[PDB]
């Protein structure tokens, strides 16, 4: 006749929570997905700070490097005069 | 008494729940793509930190040579004017 009038819940509830399955499975996948998502803003942060820091170190080296040969241009002309002893 | 006045709820939740299953899949999507951003972001970090450490090396290393260089220009200024 029709025994699935109020017997088709026997399939509705059998999927109804084989779907909160996926919601909980997914939800914990989401947990670890957002943990690795925590990686990138820092990795971005490290790149852009270490580039700036590298540039500052170049600059400061440069600033030092001029003095190294400026000061060594003086040892060539003072030492030439310590040649006629 | 068979008035399924509650299968209309045994599906208003089923629907909500595959609704949420899908919101998750699109959320899981945008994650899975940005997860690709990482070998690149690591590669740049890895390098900007390696090179930055290297410049500190040469800056340090250069600062040392420079201070031996004033040690030669000084001990020479006491030595050239000890004569004159």
Ordered by start, the domain boundaries in chain A are: 1-85
Contact call for residues A61 and B62 (beta carbons, < 8 A):
yes
Q: How far is CA A78 from CA A60, A64, A74, A82, B69, in A?
A: 28, 22, 6, 6, 14
Q: How far is CA A81 from CA A16, A84, B72, B83, B84, in A?
A: 98, 6, 15, 11, 9
Question: DSSP H helical segments within A37-71, as ranges?
Answer: 39-70
Element (H, E) at B68: helix B37-80
Q: Which residues of A touch B38 (CB under 8 A)?
A: 36, 39-40, 43
If phi > 0 it is left, if psi is from -120 to 50 it is alpha, else beta; for residue B3 that is beta
Binary contact (B49, A46; C-beta < 8 A): yes
Q: C-alpha angle with apex A23: B14 to A25, nearest 5 degrees?
A: 145
CA B61 to CA B53: how far, in whole Å? 12
Between CA B40 and CA A44 the distance in angstroms is: 9
Rg of chain A taking only CA atoms, in angstroms = 37
Instruction: Give CA–CA dist A64/A79, Å, rounded.
Output: 23
Do residue B52 and residue A47 have CB atoms under 8 angstroms apart? no
**Cα separation of B46 and B54, whole Å?**
12
Q: Are the CB atoms for A23 and B24 separated by under 8 Å?
A: yes
- Quick check: B69 and A71 CB within 8 A? yes
């Amino acid at each position: 006749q029709l025994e699935d009038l109020k017997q088709q819940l026997q399939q509705a509830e059998e999927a109804l929570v084989a779907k909160q399955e996926v919601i909980d499975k997914l939800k914990e996948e989401a947990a670890q997905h957002a943990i690795v998502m925590e990686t990138v803003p820092v990795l971005k942060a490290q790149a852009d700070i270490y580039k700036a820091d590298f540039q500052a170190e170049r600059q400061a080296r440069e600033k030092l490097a001029e003095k190294k040969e400026l000061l060594q241009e003086q040892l060539e002309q003072l030492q030439r005069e310590y040649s006629k002893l």
